[PDB]
Amino acid sequence: ELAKLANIEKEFKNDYRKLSMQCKDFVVGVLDLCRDSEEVEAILNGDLEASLSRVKLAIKYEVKKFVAHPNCQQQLLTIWYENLSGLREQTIAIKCLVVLVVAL
Amino acid sequence: ELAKLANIEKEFKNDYRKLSMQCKDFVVGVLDLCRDSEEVEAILNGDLEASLSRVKLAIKYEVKKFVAHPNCQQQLLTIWYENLSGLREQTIAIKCLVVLVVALGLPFLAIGYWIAPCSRLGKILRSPFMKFVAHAASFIIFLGLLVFNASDRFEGITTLPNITVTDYPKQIFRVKTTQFTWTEMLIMVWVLGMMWSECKELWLEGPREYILQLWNVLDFGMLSIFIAAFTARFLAFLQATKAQQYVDSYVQESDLSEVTLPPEIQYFTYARDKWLPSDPQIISEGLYAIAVVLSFSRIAYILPANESFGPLQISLGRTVKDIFKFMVLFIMVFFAFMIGMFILYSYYLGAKVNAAFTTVEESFKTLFWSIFGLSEVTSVVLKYDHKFIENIGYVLYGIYNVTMVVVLLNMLIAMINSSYQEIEDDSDVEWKFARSKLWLSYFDDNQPTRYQQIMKRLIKRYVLKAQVDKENDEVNEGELKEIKQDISSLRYEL
Amino acid sequence: FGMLSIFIAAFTARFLAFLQATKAQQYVDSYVQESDLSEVTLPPEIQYFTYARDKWLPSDPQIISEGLYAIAVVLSFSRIAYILPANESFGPLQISLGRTVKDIFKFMVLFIMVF
Amino acid sequence: FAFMIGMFILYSYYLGAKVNAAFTTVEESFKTLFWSIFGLSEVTSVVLKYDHKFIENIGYVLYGIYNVTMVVVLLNMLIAMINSSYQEIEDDSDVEWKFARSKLWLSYFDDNQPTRYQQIMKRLIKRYVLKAQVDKENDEVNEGELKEIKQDISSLRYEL
Ligand SMILES: CCCCCC(=O)OC[C@@H](COP(=O)(O)OCCN)OC(=O)CCCCC
Ligand SMILES: CCCCCC(=O)OC[C@@H](COP(=O)(O)OCCN)OC(=O)CCCCC
Ligand SMILES: CCCCCC(=O)OC[C@@H](CO)OC(=O)CCCCC
Ligand SMILES: CCCCCC(=O)OC[C@@H](CO)OC(=O)CCCCC
Ligand SMILES: *[C@@H]1O[C@H](CO)[C@@H](O)[C@H](O)[C@H]1NC(C)=O
User: What is known of its domains (chain A)?
Assistant: First the structure.
């Protein structure tokens, strides 16, 4: 809402953009404090009672530091390799062998 | 350990790199506090009960500020001039006189070196600085031999290429062009020696050490190109000797131009107009022309031992190491436009103004030379009407000339980010970590101990300095807590 | 979507070029009554499909096909931008390139006026 | 110098049969490699009249490596020049320029009981010492008051 009023006012341009930074830094400062994996998997998707709903909603609003934080990146990486799990730390030669085998 | 976990995690990348800075700054802060020379010579090499063990271990781990600190640099400088000791502060003219004298008297040095235990000049020649000057002088005499070999043609060749000329009619012509001269023998002796030294180093260092450094592979490739060129020259010499042994036996004439020869032996009478396009002579000239250009890249072994041209080289190495990421992206756009330009103009080989774009090699040639402003517009125009084809050609060639400039612009601006990142007090440090590495290439070839007492004194001084700085970091809070506790006693007494 | 449409337009032009040559072949194989097609001359509409590339009409479906097919192959190597962000070394390069290309156009509009 | 010696060693035997007269002597090879950095040179100095295509391709490759290397060196020069501007910072160009012009001006000017001078110098040094002590006292205000009230609390403990 603040980031859309910034494009409609254009004279109080810097003030709404100064308030949107507080609205983003609150979320990043909450994200920092989580310790167990249950707290991370309670923040990144909402109340259930995958499906990464808050992350897919933070793409639309472009909150870059909420997605570029390590506590979200490790949760995305454990989905990006969700059955391979030994290729997660290998050389680029082993990765090129994979794409050559699949392309063949 | 922290700097190796940083390359394996890659999500907690900044944290391990933040911890490695503390692990390095502890060592630098310990190094600061040493006062006598015994403490410096107790830190820089470990407990003995030269051999600079901690310095040689700080090269491997790349701790740049531990080697670029002055208390280590003075200890390395007192080894780098360990018998000269008056040359330590002299002008550059006196230093150039030294390298000129040693470059002149190079063949006297082995005669003076078998004497060396009986000579004070033998110990005065076995210092690291004299070894460095000797290797530099030998490599300069090598380039001098190449340029002098290239001599006698500096103002043109004297004849025409298709005309032959020999000492006598009997001599076959192909011998005189391929036989050896005295300077090429010295080149042959010199290349084998450098190949032998690199052969010894590869056997001891191992393949991983050779493969790890890009510079080692460049040197070894230059030596191999020299050897291949001389083998091609020798194969060219042998067949001419065989033809001369044929003619001098079975000639039975007055001149070799009088009676015609069998046609295999007839081929070795022709000038350069009629040689086969895969002649060993031609291959020899090509590879020998590549190797001479590659053999002036060896001055990078010399240049870091100088203050003025020192930090220049480091920035040049950084920019050359940072170009290749842009180069890989530029290859994709280049390949796209060359495949499109080849698919367009391939059917018009017979009817064009210029011979460009009609084959893949020529399209590669035109799109490569078009980025240096050395190309024509009139490669695009053709002879027939077909104006749709010609306008699509103009449009695609214009899009290419705009795209290369944009990519170039992006490269320059990204280069600026590195300078801002460099900030200050690092080029001086980085350059020092260059030259010391170069110096360490030549140095080679109950009741506690004294060492533990010295180390205990150093750690005690570090703890005391840290507590003094922590106490002076916050002065008011202790006094306020003390006067609050005093007000507690004043409330208890009143 | 534009790259895909340019491909489809080029192949439709090629097919329109193929149909008329099939019509001329079905004419000649029916009404030829000769030994070779070079022997007896033809009606002049069917005669046109014997010429080489020197005498084609400047709006031939073949020429349009070659031009659009030459544009589409150049446009079809811009799809590697879907691949490149999944890599650490060529990752932050692309982003700066996208930023500079997005920032050129404001200068380009001002350059068009002077030009 | 590296590229000119290589280009001279390559094309020296082909003086009679080339399109252009370039690279066939040291003076001419110097000329071509000097004017090639200002985009005032031809590709057709490399091509020759005979077949010998190995020689011609090595010529094209070395000339391309030269044209890339000069641009890289040039790029390095420009970026290193930027470091000096960042180092210059502010309040120095104005100062440096003044130290120019005054030098120019000084080229033309040419052709017991203490003295007055020592009284003036004594007054100046006294003012410098006083200003330094005032700035050092105002650099740390709270610590003297806390030490004074601690010493006053000592007397309050002695009296009570
Ligand atoms: C300009 C190219 C010269 C390359 C080497 C170089 O700069 O070093 C200059 C001195 C060696 O330096 P020092 O150890 O005396 O220290 C220089 C002090 N700034 O002497 C040499 O190392 C020069 C050896 C060359 C003689 C043939
Ligand atoms: C250099 C162009 C290659 C484009 C893709 C690319 O860089 O990605 C490299 C890997 C994928 O990366 P990962 O997810 O394994 O992570 C890389 C870790 N730095 O493998 C690929 O995605 C490559 C697929 C191409 C094979 C045909
Ligand atoms: C637009 C229609 C151009 C008509 C074709 C013609 O005859 O020449 C014009 C052509 C050749 O110079 O223009 C260009 O170079 C295109 C540059 C585009 C920049 C993104
Ligand atoms: C690689 C093989 C090239 C074949 C030789 C030929 O016929 O022309 C290609 C040659 C001349 O343009 O290419 C170059 O300019 C080389 C540039 C290299 C950049 C580091
Ligand atoms: C050699 O080439 C020159 C070129 O002008 C020509 O005049 C001459 O006749 C040629 N000589 C022979 C022997 O072919």
Answer: The cytoplasmic portion of the protein is required for channel assembly and gating.
